[PDB]
């Protein structure tokens, strides 16, 4: 038993090299705003490796060298299970509050749900603010620096900002100003953070 | 040669479980806007695994089962080397244009470099626009939906937007409007995309 163990070790080296390549590709280009295809690919790997990670930990727990590695394996298994269930709970609450597919993006925790002309456009947010500004700039609405389409000063008198846990802020139109062109200033100030979901 | 190969296989199973845990943690929480510590940790793993990935590929190339896997290993090694050198070239050009540490973030490709009161504040951008709006909202500048500090209508008459390859847009103040409060509308329109770097 000399050469076949070396051959399988070389196969495992090639396999771990391939997984390292996938890791590097996911960490370098797989992002929502960089490559949607690679973003979906990263989501698929996360969703399929969570149960595989749990199974690997329980397999490394059933076998052991001593009763030290077994406890560590149990701790890792329960930690990743807690993270898994917490992510599903947060995503399910998010998708119960809004109706967008951005609820499953780990990169984003705050989401906007502005409907422009009957379609609820969803854009990510970085911080929760009392008042959110909005400019038109010749008929190109840019709420929170997000291009949403073509509109003028006659906007929607309501906005909702969802978060991972509670925090369903409700906004309304206010402070409408016009210029010589087709631009504007009308912002949205929050007035209620209750009445969760829809 | 029966039991020691099984023991080392169990050790490798535990090791691959730990690496899977690190992969899941990096893909679930390690983001610039989610956890700065985990973002730096992910950057460190990327920077240390790029040469390790190259070394693993050249090691899997020097050994082979036949002259088929060697060519694949060479192709993977040269591909990851090209990606590595391209990332360094892009980051070095970015850090030669601006003077911010955001140049090494794979999540961001467009960066803003607005100096407010002598300090060049750097904020990420999603798209390159001809005109960028800016609101004040009671003394809280929000250029491109990025809170920068406390200021009023008397802003900086210049902005620069850097990109990965060339595209050093220069902006200037324009369309300044005031309201009854301490808010504003003054935006920035691009007038030059030349004179790269500083």
């Amino acid at each position, epitope marked *: 038993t000399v050469e076949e163990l070396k051959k399988l070790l070389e196969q495992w080296n090639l396999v771990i090299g391939f997984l390292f390549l996938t890791w590097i590709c996911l960490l370098q280009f797989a992002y929502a705003n960089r490559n949607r295809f690679l973003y979906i690919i990263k989501l698929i790997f996360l969703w399929l490796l969570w149960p595989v990670t749990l199974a690997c930990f329980v397999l490394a727990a059933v076998y052991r060298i001593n009763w030290i590695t077994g406890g560590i394996a149990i701790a890792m298994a329960c930690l990743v299970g807690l993270m898994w269930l917490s992510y599903f709970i947060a995503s399910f609450r998010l998708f119960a509050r809004t109706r967008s597919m951005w609820s499953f993006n780990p990169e984003t925790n705050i989401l906007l749900n502005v409907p422009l002309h009957g379609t609820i456009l969803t854009r990510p947010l970085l911080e929760s603010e*009392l008042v959110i500004g909005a400019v038109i700039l010749r008929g190109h609405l840019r709420i929170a620096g997000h291009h949403l389409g073509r509109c003028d000063i006659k906007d929607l*008198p309501k906005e909702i900002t969802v978060a991972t846990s509670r925090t369903l802020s409700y906004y*309304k139109l*206010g402070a409408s100003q016009r210029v010589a062109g087709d631009s504007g200033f*009308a912002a949205y*100030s929050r007035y209620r953070i209750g009445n969760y979901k829809l | 040669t029966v039991e020691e190969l099984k023991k080392l296989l169990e050790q490798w199973n535990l090791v691959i479980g730990f690496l899977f845990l690190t992969w899941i943690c990096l893909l679930q929480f390690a983001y610039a806007n989610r956890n700065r510590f985990l973002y730096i940790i992910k950057l460190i793993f990327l920077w240390l695994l790029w040469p390790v990935t190259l070394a693993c590929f050249v090691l899997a190339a020097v050994y082979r089962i036949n002259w088929i896997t060697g060519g694949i290993a060479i192709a993977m090694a040269c591909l990851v080397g090209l990606m590595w050198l391209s990332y360094f070239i892009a980051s070095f050009r970015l850090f030669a244009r601006t003077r911010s540490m955001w140049s090494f973030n794979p999540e961001t490709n467009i960066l803003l470099n607005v100096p407010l009161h002598g300090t060049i504040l750097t904020r990420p951008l999603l798209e390159s626009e001809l005109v960028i709006g800016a609101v004040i909202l*009671r003394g809280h500048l929000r250029i491109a939906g990025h809170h920068l500090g406390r200021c009023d209508i008397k802003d900086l008459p210049k902005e620069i937007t850097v990109a990965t390859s060339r595209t050093l847009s220069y902006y200037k103040l324009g369309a300044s409007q005031r309201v009854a*409060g*301490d*808010s504003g509308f003054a935006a920035y329109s691009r007038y030059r995309i030349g004179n790269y770097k500083l």
Partner: antibody
Amino acid sequence: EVQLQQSGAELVRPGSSVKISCKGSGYVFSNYWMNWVKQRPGQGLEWIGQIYPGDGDTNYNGKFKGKATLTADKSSSTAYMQLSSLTSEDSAVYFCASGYLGENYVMDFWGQGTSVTVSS
Amino acid sequence: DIVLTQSPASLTVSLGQRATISCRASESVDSFGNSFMHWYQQKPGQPPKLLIYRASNLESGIPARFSGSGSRTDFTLTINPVEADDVATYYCQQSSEDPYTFGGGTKLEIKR
């Protein structure tokens, strides 16, 4: 320059009803909230309720729920408050306030005040 | 309903000194990431004038002599220079819950 102008003085017999007026100029009246703060001549301020003319949504305090009715008209750019079942306790001065940005939790600019006397 | 209490009910200060007004609260006032605490100044015959909003921000058009303090249980309005035009009644208001309860009111007096 935003401003708020109310009516003059109201003198109604007990048991009757009064309708106080508050209008604004220099801003979009339909996108701004009201506060309708009540202040007794001897006591301090007392919040009553809010109203949004854009959609007619009205919030109340609970003590004035039913005593005060908040109505607004977008065409005339005027907000109204109806006070029914008036007694001697209701004799107070009412102020309507709004924010610069149209918010509801901040009162920036107020009105000159409307004094209401309930006596025979 | 938050029961706001002000202490003292009446305060007298010499011209040139500083004034300190404290507004107690029944329960926690700070909301999720915000305070929603306001201070108003009302002269006799005039509507209340907002001085400090969110307990830490100066209102536009108000002199910089007014400042706020406290966090989530107490809020203090401080006037370092006091002038002859600073005589009024100061109120404290909370805007974190539906009932916008006001303070008891503090009448400021000048010792001359």
